[PDB]
Amino acid sequence: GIVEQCCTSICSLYQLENYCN
């Protein structure tokens, strides 16, 4: 999940754009 992938290690904006609709 986004938590496991983005709270464990930092996620860039370009990586968060993966979770966009």
CA angle 15, 13, 5 (to 5 degrees): 40
Residue 12 CB, shortest distance to other proteins, in Å, is 6
User: Between the CA of residue 15 and those of 10, 19, what are the distances in Å?
Assistant: 9, 8
Tell me which residues in 1-21 interact with other proteins (CB under 8 A).
1-4, 6-13, 16-17, 19-21
Report how far residue 21's alpha carbon sits from residue 7's, in angstroms, rounded to the nearest whole number: 20
Residue 18 CB, shortest distance to other proteins, in Å, is 10
Residues that bind other proteins (CB under 8 A): 1-4, 6-13, 16-17, 19-21
